[PDB]
Curated annotation (Swiss-Prot):
Keyword Secreted on entry: yes
Stretches assigned to coiled coil: none
Stated family: Belongs to the frog skin active peptide (FSAP) family. Dermaseptin subfamily.
Gene source species: Phyllomedusa distincta (Monkey frog)
GO CC annotation terms, alphabetical: extracellular region
Protein name as annotated: Dermaseptin-DI1
Length: 33
């Protein structure tokens, strides 16, 4: 029974990007205009 708790983990493991994502995201659109 390897893996297990991958959905709850990943989502929690991707939470990082979630933030660092939008941040660097506004940078582009901002630079554009």
């Amino acid at each position: 029974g390897l893996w297990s708790k991958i959905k709850a983990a990943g989502k929690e493991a991707a939470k990082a990007a979630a933030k660092a994502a939008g941040k660097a995201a506004l940078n582009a659109v901002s630079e554009a205009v």
